[PDB]
Enzyme design. Structure first.
Site, mmCIF file in Angstrom:
data_model
loop_
_atom_site.group_PDB
_atom_site.id
_atom_site.type_symbol
_atom_site.label_atom_id
_atom_site.label_comp_id
_atom_site.label_asym_id
_atom_site.label_seq_id
_atom_site.Cartn_x
_atom_site.Cartn_y
_atom_site.Cartn_z
ATOM 1 N N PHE A 62 0.858 -1.215 0.000
ATOM 2 C CA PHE A 62 0.000 0.000 0.000
ATOM 3 C C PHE A 62 0.901 1.277 0.000
ATOM 4 O O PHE A 62 1.914 1.352 0.716
ATOM 5 C CB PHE A 62 -0.989 -0.057 1.204
ATOM 6 C CG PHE A 62 -1.754 1.166 1.596
ATOM 7 C CD1 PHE A 62 -1.078 2.251 2.233
ATOM 8 C CD2 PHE A 62 -3.121 1.271 1.342
ATOM 9 C CE1 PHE A 62 -1.717 3.413 2.631
ATOM 10 C CE2 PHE A 62 -3.778 2.465 1.734
ATOM 11 C CZ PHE A 62 -3.109 3.558 2.353
ATOM 12 N N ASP A 115 12.934 0.486 9.657
ATOM 13 C CA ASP A 115 11.576 0.564 9.116
ATOM 14 C C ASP A 115 10.554 1.062 10.139
ATOM 15 O O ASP A 115 10.111 0.318 11.015
ATOM 16 C CB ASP A 115 11.143 -0.796 8.566
ATOM 17 C CG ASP A 115 9.831 -0.728 7.809
ATOM 18 O OD1 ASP A 115 9.093 0.265 7.986
ATOM 19 O OD2 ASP A 115 9.538 -1.667 7.039
ATOM 20 N N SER A 173 5.180 -5.868 2.359
ATOM 21 C CA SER A 173 4.214 -5.194 3.276
ATOM 22 C C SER A 173 2.838 -5.912 3.216
ATOM 23 O O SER A 173 2.681 -7.146 3.570
ATOM 24 C CB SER A 173 4.353 -3.727 2.943
ATOM 25 O OG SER A 173 3.608 -2.783 3.708
ATOM 26 N N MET A 174 1.795 -5.177 2.776
ATOM 27 C CA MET A 174 0.430 -5.731 2.636
ATOM 28 C C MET A 174 0.443 -7.093 1.930
ATOM 29 O O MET A 174 -0.287 -7.997 2.339
ATOM 30 C CB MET A 174 -0.508 -4.793 1.833
ATOM 31 C CG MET A 174 -1.527 -4.170 2.734
ATOM 32 S SD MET A 174 -2.726 -3.144 1.806
ATOM 33 C CE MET A 174 -4.147 -4.347 1.937
ATOM 34 N N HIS A 195 11.097 1.213 5.395
ATOM 35 C CA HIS A 195 9.967 0.328 4.920
ATOM 36 C C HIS A 195 10.086 0.027 3.405
ATOM 37 O O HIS A 195 9.953 -1.056 2.815
ATOM 38 C CB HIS A 195 8.553 0.953 5.174
ATOM 39 C CG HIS A 195 7.427 -0.025 5.010
ATOM 40 N ND1 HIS A 195 7.385 -1.279 5.635
ATOM 41 C CD2 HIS A 195 6.304 0.028 4.284
ATOM 42 C CE1 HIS A 195 6.299 -1.951 5.347
ATOM 43 N NE2 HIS A 195 5.614 -1.152 4.528
#
EC number: 1.11.1.-
Lengths: 440, 440, 440, 440
Positions: free
Chosen positions: D32, D228, D98-99, D257
């Site tokens: 995202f 991160d 991530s997502m 991140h």
């Protein structure tokens, strides 16, 4: 998603559309030089409020095709027509913003209001922006429009920024109502519309919509920002209301042209208020039909009087203690267990809040189709068809082709959440059942 | 109901039978000159206790055919065999009263104990009632039996009343233990048996059953009335226990021959106690198999330790608060929602009392087959087949031929009471599901 | 004779039934703890009166199977349903005595009255046996009912004795209305019902039928003994009549529960009256229906009036000279040949006596389907279906699916006695024809 | 390119995807509020490395449709499933960022690893985002998450700006690792995702995946940036590795991140290492499987040992002179003609270089199915099915359903290059053959 409205050269014309949510259909028609995406604030509030939301990008804008033809209100209205008919929208609300208000007037005027429940005009063009000897009021002389055209042709890219300065009252509203980055996206949206459409759009602004006004036969809302630089409130907002006295008039104190994005909160409030009047009106008619079917299976008497009040009170919105209601039904001497199951189902479905109550054994037992596999088999078949239905009558019609055992089993299936359908379709199912039982 | 065991002349021989209840099969073999109906007191207690009850009327008695052939223990044992094999009884309990105890010894002895879990002998003939030089103990000389035969041939009708006087200790027990009218019915039952069978039965009484005794390989119960005029306790009851030390021995203080009808309360108590030992033993093995299947889907760890105790404790009978158990499962971090639904289902099924708890949304949602119509369609098909199953393995075998989605949907269907199957068949369904999931 | 209604373990459940006589079907549903045989006084009068008589034994009683399942009014209603459907009874009269009145209300309420002409309730349970805070009417609190259950467990045999005296008012009625031998047979019948059934029956007595009563659309008779201890007349009899005012009411002065055997003369009179009256009531209404259809094809005029006056007179029973009637029709200028054929057919069918007259040449010529083989082919097909229908509307409905040529040919086929159907099915055929012709 | 995953009102839901390169399939699942395009640094290295690359945009992002439904990990998992099944990917590597790491855990956990060779988690959500009394690990309380939602409503546009800096550590990384232009593109990508999607995504972040982790049977990689901010490494990274110890772990020292774009070099190295290592790991295990099957048909001896030593050596990569190997096989006294044909086939298939040698006459003669047309017919049928299978076991399973003659003929068909299948599918074919022969 796309809807094809025509042909240019070897390539069709396709209008980008996204449709969201469930409930009464609300179609949003954007302004220049933006797209269906500009109504995000309006869309999120309508979705929470429980309304189907349809947005589309006018030919030459956002993600629609960019022909070099059909820049007129007749074409734009015909484009709208195709969308409405493609989706088979009925009892729709048409909301136009700026340019979009020209679509709302022209469609209503030419095609009539058979699919239309209500209209709303935000930052409207109406009645006639051209300043002429016949009508003094119109905001500017022709020379002025000719002006804009010339400006867009010289530079679309600078021009969008210029429109933004006018459009949002940025000297007043920057860093306050909205962030600059959000504004930056709008420039990006505009830069993304067709070059031809950009220069051709301004010529549709001074279309005379005065003739269309007398046609409107459905409740209307007129909403304008008193700080509207782009469309002076007096020339259109002041004048339009006089032309359509009946429609509610709302003035947004010091709101610029871009009320929805700058002033989304005020816009949503005003719009949802006007919509609630039209929504609750057909909502009641939905409840009333259900009630006659439900009452048809109960023996005439005082109990049938007590039940009717419960149907009417919960229908009117008085949140009742479902636990109390269910115990009462459960313990009622007159009702057959089947009848009690049907009412049990209706009440849990219509009560405002179920308050986390467990499903009732008396209802599960009443709606189990006698645990018969053939009933269950047909109930599963019906369920599949009902998932494809979106109206009360379509649902009721297909349901009536099934036996009572299968219908009761289907209701149990939904009751028990082993399957799910829309509310109005569930009403059609329980009504077909009542109809079958009453007829017996 | 009838079961055909042979042919005489142009007409078959049919044994009247009624089968009742569900659970572990208990076959009751009546005494002379009565029928399966004489075990009503025994039958009602076994039904409440949760046992399948099978009764039949011996050839020549009650509603069975009345041939003039096959009055012997070999034939009677073969008649029993046909019943057992006709109904495909496994893990059956055989209970004989008086004459019926000759069937129990001879069947076990000749056919073995493959379908047999336990035996019970009430008011037994065993070991050998004929008083002979080889065995002093046997109650009467041959001349005595020859006596009865002669008496029945002279008058069946007076003779039944005479038997009743001996049979019930009526001087002692009339107007006390039982009403006369109930006694009157027994005469009616006897008068209704075949004329040939009445006189031929007494000749089977002094059959030597001593050889059969060493065969018994299953837990046995010996129960006798110390006031037994008809079968002196010492000649058979005293002697038989010495021949089979292992079997529990119960003496019913001052009970006549007709203990069950006169002394049904004492009989039921004694019988259900002995049965409970054999019932609980295979009941545990039913729980244990289920547990391995249930545990197979849970990830190894401390949680799997907590779950196992719950499976074991409720299985052992510790009534647990299902509401507390369900909340715990519901809130467990480790479990997949599917896993939690399966456990949810298992617990509600096995917990002693559900305490009127509503079905749980987490389980209904977990076992809904994703609301898919094809899953539901197959689940309904499986359900139909499961209604015809009576064992854990038959149920599990047919279930494994269905996909996991259909199996989960079927479980939801049972969970939600939209259908019903026997407990062991439901266990086979949840176990097939666990097996399918574990294998994935 | 047996009718299988279900399955219990390895056995089916069979209901013993008796079919006697010819004429309108009358189904008798016995009381506890008796069998179809208890109606012997009523059965004989009905046979003399010319009514087909159907009796059956409720499961657990007389000669039916004795399962340990299904003892509830839903089960009882469904058992009855199977009997009705097995025998394809139409225009049946349902008569219940005591327990049997629970079947009548249940069958009517759940399944409807399509096969049912009238109902009769003798010594009725309804509306509610139970005494609750909600209802003044109920006769006793739950605990006494539980106790009656308890009595059966202690003594089925001995119990029957005390029950019989209350049932017959033996202190009052012995040696006069009722013989000792007759009472003895009743005890024997009861002793013969299933042990499980005797204790489970009393729990069905306080079933609530109040919701059920509103359902019936068919003339009813309520008959009660004012001396009835078993079912207090005022508590139930007063209550039920108030709940169903329209149904005829008869009080049998000082009759006990067991009234029909004691009071067979009063019972027969009341029943035969109700049957004859309800029959003529549906004959007259049926006759009126036929006349409108017949008149619909005639031109307005004097001839039409004559058909109207003539039909009405023969319908009312005035035996007319068919020979005179036929000549008149034959010679009528107004009458169509087809109408003469249709009217000719109607008159010969409805006239009291044909006086050995002959089938009219015109009717033979008017109803010959133009001698067309396809018409005749379809007429033969229709005839086959009509042989299966005993109801005016069922006959009329199937007939309307055939063309007029085929319908006229079918009528000729019946007219000429090449085939035969009931009277009310023949009326439906001629009415479908009139309907088709009138519509043209 | 699009793949349709569902329907929303009148429109379908389409996921934009890209297919590139050839070789083992690697599916990249973006974070995202970005799209498949965000993997551009990784995609390029993979293409150079020789791996097929599949990217897609999650619904609501980049070029996929923007429904107002389906934003949950079950939905995300099912969307992924459709992609996998649409493209018939086997032996795929799933890489989530991530997502995207929520998709990887969900797909593996619910659907299993049949199409999956390995997984990789970069900047992972798991196990649990949420901070609860039960779990120490969770990063934040619910209210902050609710607030992030709230921020999106106020400004999607303005929000992206603050989010990007945290995502990239722009104070640290601007003008070095990351250019301003690169950041600008990211904002543009986000501004382009659906308005509804942006606010609904943050609610999926605290999904609990702990139960999910135990599921995976396929080698995994965990990679996190120690700098991160968006997903605190210790809170999630420390927690996840403890939950899955076996999977390889890489910490990227001071990486934010957004590490891959900034830290593409570290990412590529780590990823290409994991891919090459996991590939050779399954090649060696696959090689061992082939050897046991091949050895199973040989007689115990020196020749068998040579096949064992020779196979092992070529399998380990020692390029052997196939010409020398083939002559040796050809001249072996021990070797069966069929074995030489089978071994001949195996060796040419597994030898590093064939050195432009020729197909052996014996192999051509040994693998010709005796020139039988039915064998050849079935071999052609098998071949068709094998072209559809990329898995050693799927190939072996379908092959075992064919006779040995047909299997040998199929092998000759492949040997002679009259048809072609993957290597591991060819191994399954020769192994099914060996299995059939050994069993004989």
């Amino acid at each position: 998603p796309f809807i094809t409205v025509g042909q240019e050269n070897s390539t069709s014309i396709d209008l980008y559309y996204e449709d969201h949510g469930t409930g009464t259909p609300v179609v949003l028609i954007h302004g220049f030089p933006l797209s269906g995406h500009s109504w995000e604030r309006q869309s999120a509030a309508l979705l929470d409020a429980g309304y189907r939301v349809i947005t589309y990008d006018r030919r030459g804008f956002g993600q629609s095709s960019q022909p070099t033809t059909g820049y007129d209100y007749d074409t734009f209205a015909a484009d709208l027509n195709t969308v409405l008919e493609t989706l088979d929208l009925q009892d729709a609300v048409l909301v136009g913003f700026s340019m979009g208000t020209g679509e709302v007037a022209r469609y209503v005027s030419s095609y009539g209001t058979a699919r239309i429940a209500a209209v709303a005009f935000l930052a409207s063009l109406e009645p006639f922006l051209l300043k002429t000897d016949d009508n003094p009021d119109g905001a500017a002389p022709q020379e002025f429009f000719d002006g804009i055209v010339a400006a867009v042709k010289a530079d679309r890219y600078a021009f969008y920024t210029g429109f933004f300065n006018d459009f949002y009252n940025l000297d007043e509203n920057l860093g306050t109502r909205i962030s600059e980055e959000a504004v930056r996206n709008s420039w990006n949206t505009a830069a993304s519309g067709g070059f031809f459409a950009a220069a051709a759009a301004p010529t549709t602004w001074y279309t005379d919509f005065r003739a269309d006004i007398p046609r409107i036969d459905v409740p209307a809302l007129i909403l304008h920002g008193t700080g509207d630089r782009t469309l002076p409130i007096e020339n259109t907002a002041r004048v339009f209301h006089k032309a359509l006295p009946s429609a509610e008039y709302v003035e947004v104190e010091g709101a610029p042209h871009g009320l929805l994005w700058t002033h989304a909160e005020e816009v949503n409030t005003a719009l949802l208020a006007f919509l609630a009047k039209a929504q609750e009106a057909q909502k009641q008619k939905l409840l009333t039909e259900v009630e006659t079917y439900v009452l048809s299976i109960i023996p005439s008497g005082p109990l049938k009087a007590e039940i009717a009040q419960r149907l009417e009170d919960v229908f009117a919105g008085k949140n009742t203690d479902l636990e109390v209601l269910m115990e009462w039904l459960k313990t009622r001497p007159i009702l057959s267990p089947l009848t009690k199951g049907i009412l049990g189902f209706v009440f849990t479905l219509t009560v405002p809040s179920e308050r986390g109550l467990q499903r009732r054994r008396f209802v599960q037992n009443a709606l189990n189709g006698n645990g018969d596999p053939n009933n269950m088999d047909k109930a599963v078949k019906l369920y599949r068809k009902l998932k494809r239905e979106i109206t009360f009558h379509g649902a009721k019609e297909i349901s009536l082709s099934y036996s009572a055992g299968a219908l009761a089993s289907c209701m149990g299936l939904i009751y028990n959440r082993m399957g799910a359908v829309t509310t109005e379709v569930a009403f059609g199912l329980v009504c077909a059942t009542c109809e079958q039982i009453a007829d017996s």
